Amino acid sequence: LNVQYEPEVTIEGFDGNWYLQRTDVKLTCKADANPPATEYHWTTLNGSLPKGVEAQNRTLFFRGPITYSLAGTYICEATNPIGTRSGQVEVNITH
């Protein structure tokens, strides 16, 4: 297209406060750009992946209900010919 921009990374899924007993607590990472992407980077603020999440492509599928060990910042970066952008989300567990 006439416009070329670095991929816009967005987090989708449960919008709001995350409830312990809910399977709706999964998140999807989307990068929107003129070209899809050349590379995709998925990393959390802790640099590691929790044992409660099942990762599939740019989709964060939670294996079940959200737990305290599932709380934190999930970030993803997309590498494109126009640049690299990252999106993050901060999940908190209800009390």
From Swiss-Prot:
Family membership noted in the UniProt record: Belongs to the nectin family.
Assembly notes: Cis- and trans-homodimer. Can form trans-heterodimers with NECTIN3 and with NECTIN4. Interaction between NECTIN1 and NECTIN3 on the pre- and postsynaptic sites, respectively, initiates the formation of puncta adherentia junctions between axons and dendrites. Interacts (via cytoplasmic domain) with AFDN (via PDZ domain); this interaction recruits NECTIN1 to cadherin-based adherens junctions and provides a connection with the actin cytoskeleton. Interacts with integrin alphaV/beta3. Interacts (via Ig-like C2-type domain 2) with FGFR1, FGFR2 and FGFR3. (Microbial infection) Interacts with herpes pseudorabies virus/PRV envelope glycoprotein D.
Knockout mutant characteristics: Mice are viable and fertile but display microphthalmia. Microphthalmia is accompanied by a separation of the apex-apex contact between the pigment and non-pigment cell layers of the ciliary epithelia. Mice also show abnormal incisor teeth, due to hypomineralized enamel. In the auditory epithelium, impaired formation of the checkerboard-like cellular pattern of hair cells and supporting cells, due to aberrant attachment between hair cells.
Subcellular localization: Cell membrane; Cell junction, Adherens junction; Presynaptic cell membrane
Parent sequence residues shown: 241 to 334 of 515
Stated role: Cell adhesion molecule that promotes cell-cell contacts and plays important roles in the development of the nervous system. Acts by forming homophilic or heterophilic trans-dimers. Heterophilic interactions have been detected between NECTIN1 and NECTIN3 and between NECTIN1 and NECTIN4. Involved in axon guidance by promoting contacts between the commissural axons and the floor plate cells. Involved in synaptogegesis. Has some neurite outgrowth-promoting activity. (Microbial infection) Acts as a receptor for pseudorabies virus/PRV.
Glycosylation sites: 46, 57, 92
Renumbered residue ranges of the record's region Interaction with FGFR: 42-59
Organism: Mus musculus (Mouse)
Record text about domains: The Ig-like V-type domain is involved in homophilic interaction in cis, a prerequisite for cell adhesion. Ig-like C2-type 2 mediates neurite outgrowth through binding, induction of phosphorylation, and activation of FGFR.
Superkingdom, natural source: Eukaryota
Disulfide bonds listed in the record: 29-76
Protein's UniProt name: Nectin-1
Ig-like C2-type domain location: 7-94
